[PDB]
Amino acid sequence: AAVQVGGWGFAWIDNEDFSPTGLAWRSGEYFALAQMKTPETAHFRIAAQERRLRIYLRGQKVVNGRNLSDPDSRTVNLPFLMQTPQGAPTLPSTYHPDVAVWAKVGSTWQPCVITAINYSTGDVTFTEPAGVTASDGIEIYYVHGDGQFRLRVARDDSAATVFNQSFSTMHSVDQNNVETMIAWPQQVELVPGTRLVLEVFTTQVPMVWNERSGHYIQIAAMGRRIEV
């Protein structure tokens, strides 16, 4: 067969390139949470000692709606909640880098206003909207420090670990910058047929990958077209 390789271009490997595996969370054991399947016409390369790397993964807590007649404050405790060095807007806010609260009103999910975040106790206060009826109608996604994660390259065990950090280190060490910084260890090739698998290991904090989870991944890479 004939193989044509295109020119190299800068590419961010980001969270949007990952798809959920659909695996359910389990305590104290690694499991594939999400995966980046390399396209049939692509080759990606992550450099040895790569430092343009940002990873902020979220834990999940699901609480019941109180079917309020009017909006009201709701306080939920978030085990292993962590502050990241990321720029945070002033509270009240619906966007916050460390916490995102969603409420289901009828059939529609909506972001909730966060009014207080206590990193010392893990308590987060948000305004619950009126008419949240479901027993699982409130989902809270937050940056946590329970356990670790790894990135593996799988073929088609035949899967090699290419990156591994605890959540407490990955989530607390910078950006802006140096001395403490985390570097990608070795050069990695993502050729057609390979999968970059995200595996997580937590004991008490459930982790799901869905449309509301807001996981953040940004890894500097090089990409090129490959045609057969």
TrEMBL record:
Annotated ranges, domain VP17 central beta-barrel: 63-144
UniProt-recorded name of the protein: VP17
Section of the entire sequence shown: 41 to 273 of 291
Organism field: Thermus virus P23-77
Domain of life, source organism: Viruses
